Design a protein around this ligand. Structure first.
Ligand SMILES: CSC[C@H]1O[C@@H](n2cnc3c(N)ncnc32)[C@H](O)[C@@H]1O
Ligand SMILES: CSC[C@H]1O[C@@H](n2cnc3c(N)ncnc32)[C@H](O)[C@@H]1O
Ligand SMILES: CSC[C@H]1O[C@@H](n2cnc3c(N)ncnc32)[C@H](O)[C@@H]1O
Lengths: 273, 273, 273
């Protein structure tokens, strides 16, 4: 609704995770305040240009990693991006691996998730009187997933083309007994803390959302269990590769997502009663 | 405690789910306001007669399906029914199926559940100083389950006589990876969003509660995944069969539940410390 | 920060569960009020001496079992113990068994857990701006676990030396379908309602925390399902054995936990960003 400065619009949104607090990639940056009914987003949104495409960057944890996963205002974040007019949302996330072949340093473009959060307080925008139940059988935007995979291939990086993300509550990491459940019982591939309810809200807002995950650790399975310092060090070490992928992909998003390859682009048509 | 109009009492409660916003079945209807310590129930309770039995009808989603599963005031709803004197509670619900032989249009009378909710805020009436831990090994009222099965058989409808209900948080439907967990790992039969904490509270209030579920969809497993519009269309198409079952069952509930076939009828005797 | 009376300090904390509302074991008892940023702990903390070691006793449910698991102020409880200077925390808990050989009356010293809670509201002390993600691969303090096992052996009691605790939300007990999941799918050994987030917070506070669990029931698996009255009766019947173990262990805790056998003793060094 109201923005300061007024009149600002963007086409692509990038939500940065661990290690990605500044855009790096946007020219002509302007910090924008966007009103939301849910109060403050995680930080200012930075709007600028990448090869003629207008991009909105939001660090989900705020500058300086000030906001842990459970305390993020997910509703304000997604509302703010929608308000600016974005159609595509690239999330960049750090994840743990539950399988030997998904190695630290590899990218993953997941296609499924399992929600094991509990304390995120709001899992939807729709609390009534219009009841909305979106279909999320195929929760990510396939058009954007395929573009991410392609860019990774072209640049010569390893990109695993599928994966189930188990989203846990945190902020503590998993016990060994929990991790055995995620790996051996649920048959999940990667693990993180921030995907839900971000993805739910993106789908309800009819955005084309996909995750570019970077494997930072093997959870509890290496001779040393994951620590926060390790995750951060690995992301910061590799952020340049993530930036090179964004620069490659974003110019190709000048147009609109293909409806037939965007499960949520018309989600509300059959979801609202 | 206080009702408007004053003095109103009922013996059987019917909680209507998706597609069931009006009683249809009650003669001589009166809309009643019932005070609760938890504020407003979902809507007015409609009290009237069915073949000499006094019935209280409550639409859990309110008239017009205004209240999604996560926003229902479950405590107020059950408190209000208890206050009116009801002994039997029939819940009518739409569910998805996780097995080929439980087909859209079939009824199910479940006997078990698995709670995978997270955001319902209150799962009990007892927050202290009397600590209450009810046994829910056999969570539904067997007396009422058997009566529902019998009515269905007599009318010639398909009624599956057992089933495990997995209750999910919503309002979004399951991902494919989640649905594989419910089906192949938990070995659940049906899926919905509204049973918990409704059943918990019913048990704590010493009510004989059972669910008459109607299968509306196959979750993510048919060539088209479930949508909200499909669920609603299927319930509205079949509501007449649900009404015919209620008319058959209710006259037979003139008496009291049999204690030996009512796991929660004396739940508080051994549960309170 | 502020205590009344002023100047009080303790070295060992004991958190008593079901059936353990009074210390029994402390000489020279003083009831202490300890300020916390989170309001009231469950009750007064009782500080006194056991063979020259200063002990702080807190009943997690309050005197008279006034506070159910979901309503405990876990943050205030752990903050208060930390403020008094304690280094070791022994929790005494009632648990159900999911295996024939862990019998009512046996002690268990668990080594793992699985968190299936949902409604505890705060799972950490750290909501920002310092983000903290503690490693809990090995969540209990091994130094204290080994001391508990030793004491049990010396006194001639059965003490199972490992176990996975599944923590459920409650206050209702599990359905049969849930219990089959905990036992046959998760392969958990024991079940309770109070461990989480108590253990999370203990770890974040850099305490050496371990659980001495007493098996009070077989969950839904004996010909009679668990009831609250049974749990309480069994704990009260056996509290004397729990007291004899505490008297044996506490004098041996005059020193400090061994860092190499205390996973959380330096948890914050690698966890904070
Ligand atoms: C900076 S350390 C915390 C971040 O690590 C991410 N993450 C990385 N590895 C894991 C893991 N093994 N388990 C859970 N979250 C992880 C989470 O999404 C979280 O925001
Ligand atoms: C009107 S669409 C929403 C309703 O569908 C019911 N339901 C029907 N099918 C499913 C399903 N497959 N998964 C979850 N809930 C379902 C839920 O209890 C909810 O209130
Ligand atoms: C006094 S009865 C309630 C207590 O029983 C403990 N407990 C004992 N047996 C079980 C069980 N089978 N399931 C869950 N909690 C149990 C819980 O931690 C709770 O605080």
């Amino acid at each position: 609704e109201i923005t300061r400065p007024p009149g600002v619009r963007a086409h692509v949104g990038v939500i940065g995770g661990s290690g990605l607090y500044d855009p790096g990639i946007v020219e002509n940056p302007v910090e924008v305040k966007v009103s939301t009914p849910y109060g403050n987003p995680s930080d200012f949104i930075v709007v600028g240009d990448v090869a003629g495409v207008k991009v909105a960057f939001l660090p989900r944890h705020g500058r300086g990693h000030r906001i842990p996963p459970h305390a993020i205002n997910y509703r304000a974040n997604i509302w703010a991006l929608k308000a600016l007019g974005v159609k595509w949302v690239i999330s960049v996330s750090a994840v743990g691996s539950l399988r030997e072949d998904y190695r630290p340093g590899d990218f993953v473009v997941p296609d499924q998730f399992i929600d094991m959060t509990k304390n995120r307080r709001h899992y939807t925008f729709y609390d009534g009187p219009v009841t909305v139940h979106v279909s999320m059988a195929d929760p990510f935007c396939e058009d954007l997933r395929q573009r991410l995979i392609d860019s990774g291939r072209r640049l010569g990086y390893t990109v695993h083309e599928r994966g189930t993300y188990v989203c846990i509550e945190g902020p503590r990491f998993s016990t060994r007994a929990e991790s055995r459940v995620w790996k051996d019982v649920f048959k999940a591939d990667i693990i993180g803390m921030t995907l839900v309810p971000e993805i739910n809200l993106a789908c309800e807002a009819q955005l084309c959302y996909a995750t570019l995950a970077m494997v930072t650790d093997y959870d509890v399975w290496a001779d040393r269990p994951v620590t926060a310092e390790e995750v951060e060090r690995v992301m910061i070490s590799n952020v340049e590769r993530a930036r090179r992928m964004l620069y490659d992909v974003i110019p190709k998003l000048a147009g609109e997502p293909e409806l037939e390859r965007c499960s949520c682009c018309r989600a509300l048509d059959t979801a609202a009663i």
